[PDB]
């Protein structure tokens, strides 16, 4: 994570994916890619929650604003069920 | 003057309540899943004999994270519909909780239990696992949303019970 | 998975309010995605008969799971991340 | 702000007023929640307020308890904390509201709900006064409201830890026993007391041999004490005062008794105690039956219902202890009592006679009702062999002496039916003599013309059960079966009542289960039986229902299985059978039970199709199969399980055929026009997916010359299938169809090649789904492998919007190359790419692609919110270089390897398009990987 300022670490995700034993060997780009995609989708939700908070006219964040944001986003609804 | 009856629709989230009321309202089966939040009131009218029957369907959110003040919507309910998915046994397991809450808020309104999503090829719960309803003098009706299998039947039964007219049919 | 989410939080949004249950449920959603993505990735790997999970597997997995504009945004940032990390 | 004004507006039907009121209260309660809670409890406490207003306050309070009461709740919020003083004030109000008898039951239920939610965390340590107040009311005042409150607490918040280790379990059992022992207590309180005992037994029911001496000793001590008290309660008699409460008192007692027997080890429930409990349990049936004499006055409707409800538990207890020995004296008591209880009520008899559809649902078991008659079935089914012989002896004897009593004959016949459903064989000293008498009177029932319809229907249904159970005892079964079945069918034909006709059809199903009608009846007799049954089916089908149709298919399936062989096949019955299965099924297409059962019927009838009789089946089936297409045409081809089934079963008709060659043009002439209209004018994808593959097989199994005039017609389908009108979920199905049409009509497709290429490229460039575009690109690469030069020329000539189409199609191809997963599709894609590289046309050299991505600056994650002002950038590289990088990257990742290295070797043989310089521009790892193959 400290190579080029990446946020999420590689060891934790690597051991989490190794505990499932989904494959015999892990590719070199798989950990960095998954850290990248995961953090991106997390932000997609945090920023949505934030705008819902701004929509609430309150800088604070509570799960009600998150629920409003997820319900508003139809594609996010389909992705998250 | 057309009599009106308040109807509350409850069930586990993801069971197909809003799609059912939308199909009854228009006649088009909705595909993508949009989780209902809060409560939406959809007036319903049925062209029958012996007068006209008007329903005020109170669709309720099936997820506890969206059902804010959910128990406060059955205050003046006269008839309720508890519908559960037959593709998942969890909805049937949750049905007794729905019935208990409905009975607690309002004592002895007529309740009809509907098994939705019967058009699917396989059902994890069959007609032999409905032990709850047979001991509570409830009425079990098998309906589907993709098809029109018995889609007007529960409303017909509720109207018959409410109007006290066993010889009432829809047209 | 705490300092990372708090730091992305403080960089994307300067002014915000925070409670523990918020990123508690956030952790939950991301964990669900990681498990889901582990499912699809593993299944396609078995389907293509490769004992090693590599880039093409997760490109395929992300593409099939996430639809729409966020899908191409995701693959774009993943690609720039791997090139900025391969060198 | 006013709380009273807020609640009245919070229950308004209008969305806007309800939303603002709801969000105002929650926002107001978010800050200084103590103010709202005190005001909310005040509204409920006020007597002058409306009942609806008060009920909403308590129900709203319960939800707010999970939010602001105290930490430990999943939905708890730390924004505002209720003060301890306010918390105690609510507790006093809730207890006062849930205990006084002057309050409405609606308020008490709401108050109890709030108390349960509060008790989810505070009970029992943080709220010691709750149990002490409740216990005082029950012990000294027998407060039903307090006792009912304890039941709710036990159901939701009491677990094993506070039951056994905590003092809740021991204290409650002592209090419950005290109430039961005290004869001065009112009867109505005892019903509530035993309901509390049932909740207590639930905690002990999870024993499964606890590994704890304290738990085991406590459980055993209470169970023995409760059993002695329960037995003591039954002996006491109340008289004729409050008969309704007496039945409820007995009903709950026996419900506990079956719980002890069926949810505990045999050591706790002594075998001798079962004999003691079996005595008055039988006697209670006599008492319940003699109560019906007073119920005959019809003083109250629930009085008759309560008799049946109470008797169900009594019969249920006898089922649990059915393994015990039954004396001959008590043998008659059960049978005599059960005959009265199993008697059909006037309302039920009126309903069945008026509407035979309801009878079919109940008889076939699909009905959702459950009465004492069904419970009596369980008791007789679970009986063991030694008692079953005595069971059959008395019942058969009782039937003989009750031949002239039509009032109670139906119950005895139904009881006999339940006995014969038992799995154990019935062997006895004088069964042979009894069996001869039983069939003799059963035969006379059919002969007599004054028998009521209900008795006749039961006799018809119960006749096969007698034969099936005694298949070996009877030495002349074969002549008897033919005589009875023929007699039953003749009665159904002559009778004008649908109840009898439906009963005979169900009876015919029972005949086929136990005996093979072909062997016993013979070849010619079985054919006559099939002709008789379908005539009965035709008359019944006029007035069928949702459940009648399902059973009508079941009997029809049996008739199909009894069809004669090919040398003795009869065309008349086959025509009637096929017209019948379609007629009933089309009446209720949405019925999934009918559709799946009709599928089995269709499979059996089509299982014996040969080349010799193929022509007959074509005219027998195809006109009927067209009819449903015309019937569903008026509906614009919406979803229908029948429509899905017929299209699926259309295919197997094409599949089932002699393997000499393509099918005759008669099938093509009949099916093509309705099938083409199905593919167009329809938007649903599930029916479209079934239609295209059915359509594809017809095209792939028809003569080229015969299909020549309609090559233009299918182009409209091809354009419509690839048009934006249909969903992308049905887009991928065009692949097999286009492959089949190219295989069959590779000659004359050249004029339409441009049109089909334009349609496919438009659909590919307009679609966003990965699977749809993948299948479209696979189709496109198939066409490219067919003729790359023509496709390249058309793509260069064709224009999309304002740009050359070939540019976008190539960009999409290279973009999706890295994402294709189909190994066969990978081979097609890789081979097609190699072929186009070989072509080395100058058109691709001029155009450029954007495969490589140039990273941006700022280290900021870009999402859809700012994508418009912060868009992605890609550098421009030639397609040849890009694909070369693609293969070298794939080899770095690395079956297709052999073909790809063969392509590399072929490239090295001519190094066209400046392969040397491009290879020089490659990276060190790429160069090493390429040299590994070379
Ligand atoms: N195939 C099929 N889908 C059904 C049927 N009934 C419901 N659905 C689907 O179930 C979903 C219903 O979503 P909604 O209309 O929000 O109803 P709901 O799931 O009760 O709503 P929540 O309780 O808010 O989750 C849609 O995807 C429907 O197409 C049915 O009989 N057949
Ligand atoms: Mg919904």
JSON list of N, CA and C in Angstrom, two decimals, chain D residues 238-262:
[
{"chain": "D", "resi": 238, "resn": "UNK", "atom": "N", "xyz": [-67.06, -29.26, 36.34]},
{"chain": "D", "resi": 238, "resn": "UNK", "atom": "CA", "xyz": [-67.66, -27.94, 36.53]},
{"chain": "D", "resi": 238, "resn": "UNK", "atom": "C", "xyz": [-69.17, -27.92, 36.37]},
{"chain": "D", "resi": 239, "resn": "UNK", "atom": "N", "xyz": [-69.73, -28.84, 35.60]},
{"chain": "D", "resi": 239, "resn": "UNK", "atom": "CA", "xyz": [-71.16, -28.84, 35.34]},
{"chain": "D", "resi": 239, "resn": "UNK", "atom": "C", "xyz": [-71.51, -28.21, 34.01]},
{"chain": "D", "resi": 240, "resn": "UNK", "atom": "N", "xyz": [-72.72, -27.66, 33.95]},
{"chain": "D", "resi": 240, "resn": "UNK", "atom": "CA", "xyz": [-73.23, -27.04, 32.73]},
{"chain": "D", "resi": 240, "resn": "UNK", "atom": "C", "xyz": [-73.02, -25.53, 32.70]},
{"chain": "D", "resi": 241, "resn": "UNK", "atom": "N", "xyz": [-72.35, -24.96, 33.69]},
{"chain": "D", "resi": 241, "resn": "UNK", "atom": "CA", "xyz": [-72.11, -23.52, 33.75]},
{"chain": "D", "resi": 241, "resn": "UNK", "atom": "C", "xyz": [-70.85, -23.19, 32.98]},
{"chain": "D", "resi": 242, "resn": "UNK", "atom": "N", "xyz": [-70.95, -22.22, 32.07]},
{"chain": "D", "resi": 242, "resn": "UNK", "atom": "CA", "xyz": [-69.83, -21.77, 31.24]},
{"chain": "D", "resi": 242, "resn": "UNK", "atom": "C", "xyz": [-69.21, -22.94, 30.47]},
{"chain": "D", "resi": 243, "resn": "UNK", "atom": "N", "xyz": [-70.02, -23.53, 29.60]},
{"chain": "D", "resi": 243, "resn": "UNK", "atom": "CA", "xyz": [-69.59, -24.70, 28.84]},
{"chain": "D", "resi": 243, "resn": "UNK", "atom": "C", "xyz": [-68.45, -24.34, 27.89]},
{"chain": "D", "resi": 244, "resn": "UNK", "atom": "N", "xyz": [-68.48, -23.13, 27.33]},
{"chain": "D", "resi": 244, "resn": "UNK", "atom": "CA", "xyz": [-67.45, -22.71, 26.39]},
{"chain": "D", "resi": 244, "resn": "UNK", "atom": "C", "xyz": [-66.08, -22.68, 27.07]},
{"chain": "D", "resi": 245, "resn": "UNK", "atom": "N", "xyz": [-66.03, -22.12, 28.29]},
{"chain": "D", "resi": 245, "resn": "UNK", "atom": "CA", "xyz": [-64.76, -22.07, 29.01]},
{"chain": "D", "resi": 245, "resn": "UNK", "atom": "C", "xyz": [-64.28, -23.47, 29.38]},
{"chain": "D", "resi": 246, "resn": "UNK", "atom": "N", "xyz": [-65.22, -24.38, 29.69]},
{"chain": "D", "resi": 246, "resn": "UNK", "atom": "CA", "xyz": [-64.84, -25.74, 30.03]},
{"chain": "D", "resi": 246, "resn": "UNK", "atom": "C", "xyz": [-64.14, -26.43, 28.86]},
{"chain": "D", "resi": 247, "resn": "UNK", "atom": "N", "xyz": [-64.66, -26.26, 27.65]},
{"chain": "D", "resi": 247, "resn": "UNK", "atom": "CA", "xyz": [-64.03, -26.86, 26.48]},
{"chain": "D", "resi": 247, "resn": "UNK", "atom": "C", "xyz": [-62.63, -26.29, 26.26]},
{"chain": "D", "resi": 248, "resn": "UNK", "atom": "N", "xyz": [-62.48, -24.97, 26.40]},
{"chain": "D", "resi": 248, "resn": "UNK", "atom": "CA", "xyz": [-61.16, -24.37, 26.29]},
{"chain": "D", "resi": 248, "resn": "UNK", "atom": "C", "xyz": [-60.24, -24.86, 27.40]},
{"chain": "D", "resi": 249, "resn": "UNK", "atom": "N", "xyz": [-60.78, -25.06, 28.60]},
{"chain": "D", "resi": 249, "resn": "UNK", "atom": "CA", "xyz": [-59.98, -25.57, 29.71]},
{"chain": "D", "resi": 249, "resn": "UNK", "atom": "C", "xyz": [-59.46, -26.97, 29.41]},
{"chain": "D", "resi": 250, "resn": "UNK", "atom": "N", "xyz": [-60.31, -27.83, 28.84]},
{"chain": "D", "resi": 250, "resn": "UNK", "atom": "CA", "xyz": [-59.87, -29.18, 28.48]},
{"chain": "D", "resi": 250, "resn": "UNK", "atom": "C", "xyz": [-58.92, -29.15, 27.29]},
{"chain": "D", "resi": 251, "resn": "UNK", "atom": "N", "xyz": [-59.16, -28.25, 26.33]},
{"chain": "D", "resi": 251, "resn": "UNK", "atom": "CA", "xyz": [-58.34, -28.21, 25.13]},
{"chain": "D", "resi": 251, "resn": "UNK", "atom": "C", "xyz": [-56.90, -27.87, 25.45]},
{"chain": "D", "resi": 252, "resn": "UNK", "atom": "N", "xyz": [-56.68, -26.87, 26.31]},
{"chain": "D", "resi": 252, "resn": "UNK", "atom": "CA", "xyz": [-55.32, -26.47, 26.64]},
{"chain": "D", "resi": 252, "resn": "UNK", "atom": "C", "xyz": [-54.63, -27.53, 27.49]},
{"chain": "D", "resi": 253, "resn": "UNK", "atom": "N", "xyz": [-55.39, -28.26, 28.31]},
{"chain": "D", "resi": 253, "resn": "UNK", "atom": "CA", "xyz": [-54.80, -29.31, 29.15]},
{"chain": "D", "resi": 253, "resn": "UNK", "atom": "C", "xyz": [-54.20, -30.40, 28.28]},
{"chain": "D", "resi": 254, "resn": "UNK", "atom": "N", "xyz": [-54.95, -30.85, 27.27]},
{"chain": "D", "resi": 254, "resn": "UNK", "atom": "CA", "xyz": [-54.46, -31.93, 26.42]},
{"chain": "D", "resi": 254, "resn": "UNK", "atom": "C", "xyz": [-53.37, -31.46, 25.48]},
{"chain": "D", "resi": 255, "resn": "UNK", "atom": "N", "xyz": [-53.37, -30.17, 25.12]},
{"chain": "D", "resi": 255, "resn": "UNK", "atom": "CA", "xyz": [-52.28, -29.64, 24.30]},
{"chain": "D", "resi": 255, "resn": "UNK", "atom": "C", "xyz": [-50.96, -29.72, 25.04]},
{"chain": "D", "resi": 256, "resn": "UNK", "atom": "N", "xyz": [-50.97, -29.44, 26.35]},
{"chain": "D", "resi": 256, "resn": "UNK", "atom": "CA", "xyz": [-49.77, -29.62, 27.16]},
{"chain": "D", "resi": 256, "resn": "UNK", "atom": "C", "xyz": [-49.38, -31.09, 27.25]},
{"chain": "D", "resi": 257, "resn": "UNK", "atom": "N", "xyz": [-50.37, -31.98, 27.36]},
{"chain": "D", "resi": 257, "resn": "UNK", "atom": "CA", "xyz": [-50.07, -33.40, 27.53]},
{"chain": "D", "resi": 257, "resn": "UNK", "atom": "C", "xyz": [-49.34, -33.97, 26.32]},
{"chain": "D", "resi": 258, "resn": "UNK", "atom": "N", "xyz": [-49.78, -33.61, 25.11]},
{"chain": "D", "resi": 258, "resn": "UNK", "atom": "CA", "xyz": [-49.07, -34.08, 23.92]},
{"chain": "D", "resi": 258, "resn": "UNK", "atom": "C", "xyz": [-47.68, -33.46, 23.85]},
{"chain": "D", "resi": 259, "resn": "UNK", "atom": "N", "xyz": [-47.51, -32.27, 24.41]},
{"chain": "D", "resi": 259, "resn": "UNK", "atom": "CA", "xyz": [-46.20, -31.63, 24.40]},
{"chain": "D", "resi": 259, "resn": "UNK", "atom": "C", "xyz": [-45.22, -32.37, 25.30]},
{"chain": "D", "resi": 260, "resn": "UNK", "atom": "N", "xyz": [-45.68, -32.84, 26.46]},
{"chain": "D", "resi": 260, "resn": "UNK", "atom": "CA", "xyz": [-44.82, -33.59, 27.37]},
{"chain": "D", "resi": 260, "resn": "UNK", "atom": "C", "xyz": [-44.41, -34.91, 26.74]},
{"chain": "D", "resi": 261, "resn": "UNK", "atom": "N", "xyz": [-45.37, -35.62, 26.14]},
{"chain": "D", "resi": 261, "resn": "UNK", "atom": "CA", "xyz": [-45.09, -36.93, 25.58]},
{"chain": "D", "resi": 261, "resn": "UNK", "atom": "C", "xyz": [-44.16, -36.85, 24.38]},
{"chain": "D", "resi": 262, "resn": "UNK", "atom": "N", "xyz": [-44.39, -35.88, 23.49]},
{"chain": "D", "resi": 262, "resn": "UNK", "atom": "CA", "xyz": [-43.68, -35.83, 22.22]},
{"chain": "D", "resi": 262, "resn": "UNK", "atom": "C", "xyz": [-42.39, -35.02, 22.26]}
]
